[PDB]
Symmetry: C2
Subunit: 548 residues, 2 copies
């Protein structure tokens, strides 16, 4: 069983996790000091957000050199030391491979915008690196992903006197995947890092690579043909290593990015479609939305493994839901206008659940109990909040809060001089929410989280089991099984804020004794026709074993 199947991932922005030189910006020297924390929390893989040189207009997803380390974060040596030390400790590391586009400041585009043919008469290698147009009329019927900023997907470079394509920001010019030179250019970039010992990538914005006139330009098969090339490259050149796709898409298109047994594609994809239904079912006290969405997920290849997440560095995306659901979400979870952005809500996990421990522990159990490898977003293990006064998605990207000293331990510089200012308010401020406190608090959320991860660690049916929903007779109770290697788990959870009664249909399991995973307290043995009755308190989760 491959390593990425049993792994727990944890996502972080180097620039915001821990600064080590008082300049007010996170860095690899500082990240390297903290590796002990992550490891003993129960994290196996780190996934760092982009670390490359870049004018930082989409926080360094606008890459200006693929083989660099942004000055801010340290040097290539620091990076190597970081890597060596993660590895020393049993930690895997992966990064973000930004494939669909670069910054407008990349030397490549600086050459491209000269003209189609060089002033000395000769032709320009770099102009057919990008995607140009004269009138800029192609690919209408194409959505504008950054709706609150971009009015079109073609913009007008003056130096070139033509239009260029960008699904994202104007300064993030899209890369021409019809030019096979460009495919070799990125093959280089991935070799570069993989040679250093990096254990994989999360690859970014992958549906949008190839663009055909008369289609939406998402999930095209040519796109997939390209990706197939990369996984081919890795399957040959670097056995073991991981490829992980971000695809914000409906469930039938999302599965496509695993490929087939015969034509393998990605090792992992994020389960984007389950994550909103989690929040929705919460507010509706109705888990149906969850059952439907999981029931629309085909078997994936032997090698595939789902990637499960609650939140991340981005807005809670609501693009891939019906209009009716979208509006309902906004009213229930985004009452103020500055809580919205693009087609999504820009908030951290805890503020979304109104800082309610009970609801928080609940939705983390379901993150753990589903089929996949879970990824934690940094700071949510201690219950960090947001600063909605920061532009774009910066309010969920504040500094990690280590203790109650200056800037919460992230830096010796005053908050004002940090790159993003650490939360100081009475509820979510570092005064009250920080790691050092919760390493001393016996009942803290951090201890709770460490202690539950460990519990999942001791049962592999979580990581590797099959799944099968149960009948509860009550939409607020959601039950399912996980079997793997002789182990049958029964996970029941109550999405209602008050007590709820179910009748569980355990017909398949007649004669078996249920017991608690924690302490094996015995429950009555299934009998009769196997209709097991239950009552459940507000937001309870029962994690169970069935013994034959």
């Amino acid at each position: 069983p491959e390593w990425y199947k049993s792994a727990v991932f944890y996502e972080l922005s180097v620039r915001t996790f821990q600064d080590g030189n008082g300049d007010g910006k996170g860095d690899f020297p500082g990240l390297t000091s903290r590796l002990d924390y992550l490891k003993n929390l129960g994290v196996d893989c780190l996934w760092l957000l982009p670390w490359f040189p870049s004018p930082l207009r989409d926080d360094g997803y606008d890459v200006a050199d693929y083989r660099g380390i942004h000055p801010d974060l340290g040097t290539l040596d620091d990076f190597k030391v970081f890597l060596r030390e993660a590895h020393a400790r049993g930690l895997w590391v992966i990064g973000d491979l930004v494939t669909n586009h670069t910054s407008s400041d990349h030397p490549w585009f600086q050459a491209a915008r000269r003209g189609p043919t060089l002033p000395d008469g000769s032709p320009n290698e770099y102009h057919d690196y990008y995607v140009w147009s004269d009138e800029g009329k192609e690919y209408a019927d194409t959505r504008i992903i950054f709706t609150d900023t971009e009015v079109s997907n073609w913009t007008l470079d003056e130096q070139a006197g033509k239009y260029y394509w960008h699904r994202f920001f104007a300064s993030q010019p899209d890369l021409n995947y019809d030019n096979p030179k460009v495919v070799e250019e990125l093959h280089g970039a991935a070799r570069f890092w993989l040679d250093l010992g990096l254990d994989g990538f999360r690859v970014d914005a992958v549906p949008y690579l190839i663009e055909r006139e008369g289609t939406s330009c998402e999930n095209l098969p040519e796109t997939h043909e390209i990706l197939k090339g990369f996984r081919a490259m890795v399957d040959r050149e670097y056995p073991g290593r991981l490829l992980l796709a971000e695809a914000r898409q409906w469930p039938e298109e999302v599965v496509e990015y695993f490929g087939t047994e015969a034509e393998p594609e990605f090792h992992m994809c994020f389960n984007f479609p389950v994550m909103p239904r989690l929040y929705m079912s919460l507010k509706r006290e109705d888990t149906s939305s969850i059952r439907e969405i999981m029931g629309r997920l085909p078997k994936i290849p032997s090698f595939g493994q789902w990637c499960i997440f609650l939140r991340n560095h981005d807005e809670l995306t609501l693009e891939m839901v019906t209009d009716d659901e979208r509006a309902f979400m906004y009213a229930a979870y985004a009452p103020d206008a500055r809580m919205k952005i693009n087609v999504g809500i820009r908030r951290r996990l805890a503020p979304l659940l109104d800082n309610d421990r009970r609801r928080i522990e609940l939705l983390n159990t379901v993150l753990l109990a589903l089929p996949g490898s879970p990824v934690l977003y940094y700071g949510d293990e201690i219950g960090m909040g947001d600063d909605l006064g920061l532009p774009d998605r910066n309010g969920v990207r504040t500094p990690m809060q280590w203790n109650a000293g200056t800037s919460g331990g992230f830096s010796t510089a005053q908050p004002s001089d940090c790159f993003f200012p650490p939360i100081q308010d009475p509820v979510y401020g570092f005064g009250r929410v920080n790691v050092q406190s919760q390493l001393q608090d016996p009942s803290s959320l951090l201890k709770w989280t460490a202690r539950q991860l460990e519990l999942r660690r001791a049962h592999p049916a979580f990581a590797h089991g099959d799944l099968t929903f149960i009948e509860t007779g009550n939409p607020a109770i959601l039950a399912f099984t996980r079997q793997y290697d002789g182990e049958t788990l029964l996970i029941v959870s109550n999405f209602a804020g008050n007590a709820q009664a179910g009748l569980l249909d355990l017909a398949p399991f007649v004669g078996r004794a249920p017991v608690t995973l924690s302490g094996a307290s015995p429950l009555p043995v299934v009998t009769g026709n196997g209709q097991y009755p239950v009552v459940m308190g507000k937001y309870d989760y029962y994690w169970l074993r069935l013994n034959s």
Copy 2:
């Protein structure tokens, strides 16, 4: 129905609650400015600890003047407006009344220790206020309560040249209750406050009033008669007021202190024995002991009511349990030797339960669902902690933590200057635990507690209903019913730290559906033989109503 029966009491010390002027001592003006806080919290009566002028040898139970107020706290006027402002907001306030003895600094005793007659020949009215002996030998066959500091119960005064009787500290001389002038004083002290519109008294040290040769000098009939005299007086002149006995004796020893229908005495007494038991049941995962001790409660007069609590200004008293019981408690709740004192444990509530919100709620619900007027202790609504770095039981008498400003909002004095220092530790310190945070946090403990007091208030069966334990078939689960006026309450509670299953014997209520007091979500109806199977999560509490 008499106000004291429905009410929720709240115990604070003025000296430690809020400081108006920055002297570093709480006082009435400061207290006055926090009355909205208390109104909104949900409580009905303020029990104040001793505010009388005193040298403070025995924490102000050593009184220098029963008709004044200690100067640290304010003036008689400050008190009158505090009282006018409490009342204006529907709060009753009661005070501490120390009947058996005064301080050696009381004028009475200073004037008493001259001699049986004056330097002008004439006799000395105040010689007979206290209790004198020539050889000091009477009243062997009586114990020395404070076995630690005191040797004798007679102490030699050189100025009077005689011995005086004192049950307590030698600076707390017994009043001479066989002298009728003194009974007059006791009545006049009580009348002073009752005129100001004080609503009642906690009456202190009653068993030891009268002392007789040849007895225990405890619980004597003569002493009961004075209290009847006392009760009689208040019924005549100030009807509606409350007299509550402080007195730590088993419930069947204490019933007497209510008196009888014909000859009233005290309106309320404390029930001590359940208190330790709730704690023990939790950690033994077994509730027999609670059932058993409510089972053994005597009948009490119509006007009677029991008082009932969790923690307070003193140590968790383990006098009222078996030795084997006392060991379990010390083993489970007092790992550190220095958490022990005086057959008790000197820790606040959240620390006792490892700051575990679930356990903390668990226990408060039961306190509030059980018969008896509950008294809550300042600071436990926000989960304050303790300072064992302070002597005696001053660990649990730290200043209230209002916000995260200087001295946690209590004073403008720096922490070192405050009367006792506010707690600053990582877990329970005012940077992390305070009112300002908890009001701003939609899911705080403080808000929860108000929710719950609201919930109690809506169902009179909690104040006036009878009590009937049911079966469950599993010790960790504790179920009972409250009934008054047609309404029937069913409150089920889980004392185990993991899921548990029960079979509730609801035979008396077949054909009836239980429903949630919170959002009125209903459950399966009761059917057949009336055995109603349940499941409960760790430390759950189910507050239910039964409809016909």
